[PDB]
């Protein structure tokens, strides 16, 4: 090798060192995918394509909020297939678009390139749902025939213990998503249902805990501990 | 209502053009090539492996000097490889890490890339400052870019996800021409060797030939079952083959306005990610989703060989202008040169 | 002694066959398959290589010495072969300890990402270096003596304190610290896991992880305890019935040998993912 | 509908230009493709193996 | 925008010391290797030392090895040269040269202004064909150089360089690897040759081509220069 070749190899070594350092720094973080319908408060879940960065317990995250592209999402979803988890937000107050949300969730859950990614659900606007069902003007049974015969699983999630009709309504809506998730998947990925208020700020901790379980499950599968 | 009349007229037009295509179909390519000696078994071996990427590689483009490369990955780095010595000539950081395309200018002075940011960035490689700078940020697309090509280093053809293509003026950055007519997301571009005609495939199973000088769609080909992923012209420039998501490649002819050959197998049920041609056009290469690339014969529609060695999805292919090397990117951050 | 000659020989040959077959299958599977080369398998390959070395070197010589109190090899072989024997044992034990630590990092602290290929390589080379540097006493304080008829390798020391201190160091580096590390890591994993189908499979994984520590402790306790008692406490100095002590040494060696045979099985061969990956790689 | 009108005009113009042009027969087009393949089959390295003395990627 | 300014001149007695500093601006200094080139008033250009990118490999000339110290400061974009064991031989003109090495780079495209250092009182040798030949503008003048060893490497690249020095100005790069014209040089110069024989060809001379031409090899260290051909207007 000549002097030019030796200097070029030295330059290539320096370039490779810089690339390795940058890749290490990039690998030290977690990336998620943000999805949901309109008026779902995706941008306020955590307080071309919008990106958000937050840090929890010396662990920083990146949420890739996509709003620039139109409803066509089947073709560019391949990019977000190595992410840690997917945050799926549903406006559970409005019962007209729940079927669309269920259909949208089912497609993402059964997506070919998304077969190994855990999905985190955020049923938003809990306060709006609570007041809407307390008013009694709009009844869930009008849209869902299964709501009448469904019964409360006699487990109380809220501490104050409000009207059990609200609790029965919340569990049924959560039960729909849970059943859709558990219909298929082979157990490679699991759902993490949640109930988030519009003014709720205790969301990063829930994301942080869910990501911890997902990475723990990923390590168990890869370390042959199964 | 004029809607019924227009739909009936369109149906009549489709029927008569189908009949016209049937009129010229006095033979079949597979029957014409039955008398030709087959290509036989081809055994190509990996010569170099270009390590250094730490994320999924989405695109690659051979240089016009047949030695330099450009590769793009979700890591956010654009790397130029001295293919003979595997040295990294340049490492270009990207503002947006979601890039799905890259292009190397014929003059070698410029390199382009783009993706889920709706901007086609231009980098000036040969400058007296010694580093790589940003020349032009081309904005105006309302969808994610799918493929970029350089047209005589002064015109840029871009196809985005908003069902349209465009022609750009690099010096000013304004679109000199916009190509419309696709209903699905456009996924690929290819410039003919005359640098005067080009075709694009979209998520509509339709391939359309466009006259870049006039900006009005000249030809349209249909017959695939699902989304189109990659298109490349034959070296003679009068024909082109396309790769779709329905596990088959079809060879189209511009003059005949017909399908000429179907490249598929009973054991192949995976999508197709990239298609390329040899120097002579005798060999057809396709990068499938079974982590391997098959080597089809453009005249016999058989598998002359298989390229394997990637432990993830094959993403990009390419044959150098000299025809002496083939680089096959994949999702395991590894570029392998086969010859 | 006891009427155990043929059954002991059959057990030794069975251990040889099973250990060799398991190690070669694991090594070939990892070397041939491309989707299995990972950090968690680098340590497995190191363990398999160490176990191959153990079964190739110390099995035949140790069996021959236990059967007949005669050393059939020259001075150079007496100086070198024990070195290889004990360094292979030590590197195997250190590999087990480092695997336990790696699993503890992967379980209890998943967010702080570690266990990279560079870190695994550094741990492997440090383990090899420390084993080789500690085993130089065994390399240099090995001599063969002729007894009037008899020829057995024995250690000659310039004093009654140097062998005792060296052998207590040997005990604390081969059993005490590795055992403490493994038990601490596995206790932490068991706590974090155990303390509804997911929980059931997680408890199954926890119990299968605990039984590995149990079998390691059971199969390496006797040799260490007997070596300590014989060396630093001066036990079995003037023995009339050498048959009993030689049978005890043979049993402890066989326990070590069975553990070396079982490790390539118990860590990965019975796991479903590894088993199906092996089947795909071969079939 | 303007989009229907535009589609109809595009179809009629495109298809009239395609029909009233020298549509090469499929046999002649295949002959041209075969001739090009045969002509460049002596210059394409991937089809005709080349000795390593000329191959620049030799190890 | 590319600027190179030196400092550390004056009068020094033999056996003393001095610190030279070449300040770089207008370009990515960290990505460019740097050289020091010495020119005696009556002898010509001579190589001194070389510093790689990011303080990598360091090379020194045989005649000055062990007596000089070359330092690099990437954050300050400045070169540092330490002068020790001064003698009368070191009285010359010192330049700092920009350099970069990749597949198609120009490794001697830029030269500094230079600084004056006066002191009070194997290798590859290239011989210049001539030292002075009169010229008339409008015609072609060919300059030839020879080398003691063939400069054609196994990779096909030959490492002959041509430098033109204006009277009273720093030298510039005309052709690198005997065939590629440097950026900004008008397409009137050409080069050719094989083995050890090389020629530099100028199509038509102008008033700006008066100077001294040097042939340089970059095959293996240390770097050497030719005696120099001077063209005189006539
Ligand atoms: C009492 O056993 C020995 O300390 N040995 C050491 C010297 C070689 C001796 N064998 S020999 C004389 O060359 O035939 C003998 C056999 O060592 C092998 C390898 C090491 C194993 C071990 C020892 C202590 C603690 C944990 C494991 C035992 C088996
Ligand atoms: C007791 C002797 C040393 C125990 C082994 C050292 C602890 C782990 C080392 C591996 C590592 O740090 O990479
Ligand atoms: C018992 C004495 C040795 C204890 C463990 C030393 C292992 C060193 C590796 C770091 C892990 C300790 C930790 O940070 O929790």
Numbering used by the authors:
A (entry chain A): 5 to 51, 60 to 238
B (entry chain B): 2 to 340
C (entry chain R): 50 to 197, 206 to 252, 293 to 380
D (entry chain G): 5 to 63
E (entry chain E): 1 to 121, 136 to 248
What does the study report here?
The OX2 orexin receptor (OX2R) is a highly expressed G protein-coupled receptor (GPCR) in the brain that regulates wakefulness and circadian rhythms in humans. The orexin peptides act by binding to the GPCRs OX1R and OX2R on target neurons to activate cellular signaling by G proteins and arrestins, particularly stimulating Gq/11-mediated release of calcium from the endoplasmic reticulum. We harness cryo-electron microscopy of OX2R-G protein complexes to determine how the first clinically tested OX2R agonist TAK-925 can activate OX2R in a highly selective manner. Two structures of TAK-925-bound OX2R with either a Gq mimetic or Gi reveal that TAK-925 binds at the same site occupied by antagonists, yet interacts with the transmembrane helices to trigger activating microswitches.
Using recombinant protein from Sf9 insect cells, we elucidated the cryo-EM structure of OX2R coupled to a mini-Gαs/q/iN/Gβ/Gγ heterotrimer (referred to as OX2R-mGsqiN in this manuscript) in lauryl maltose neopentyl glycol (LMNG) micelles at 3.3 Å resolution, serving as a model for the Gq signaling complex leading to calcium release. In the structure of OX2R-Gi1, N3246.55 hydrogen-bonds to TAK-925’s carbonyl group with a distance of 2.7 Å between heteroatoms, however in OX2R-mGsqiN this distance is 3.3 Å. The residue Thr1112.61 interacts with the ligand in the OX2R-mGsqiN structure such that the sidechain oxygen is 3.8 Å from TAK-925’s sulfonamide nitrogen. While the structure does not indicate a hydrogen bond between these groups, we found that mutation of this residue to alanine led to significantly reduced potency of the agonist (EC50 2.1 μM). The OX2R-mGsqiN interface has features similar to previously characterized GPCR-Gq/11 complexes. In particular, the end of the C-terminal α5 helix forms a ‘hook’ that packs against the TM7-Helix8 junction, and the sidechain of Tyr235H5.23 from this hook extends across the center of the interface to form a hydrogen bond with ICL2 of the receptor (Ser164ICL2 in OX2R). However, the OX2R-mGsqiN interface features more extensive contacts between OX2R and the mGαsqiN, resulting in burial of more surface area (1039 Å2 versus 814 Å2), Notably, the interaction of OX2R with the Gi1 α5 helix is predominantly mediated by hydrophobic contacts, and Gi1 makes only two polar contacts to the receptor’s polypeptide backbone. In contrast, active OX2R makes 7 specific polar interactions with the mGαsqiN α5 helix, including from Ser164ICL2 to Tyr253H5.23 and from Thr3026.33 to the mGαsqiN C-terminus. The backbone amide of Phe3718.50 also hydrogen-bonds to Asn244H5.24 of mGαsqiN (common Gα numbering system), and this OX2R residue undergoes a downward shift during activation concomitant with the upward movement of Tyr3647.53.
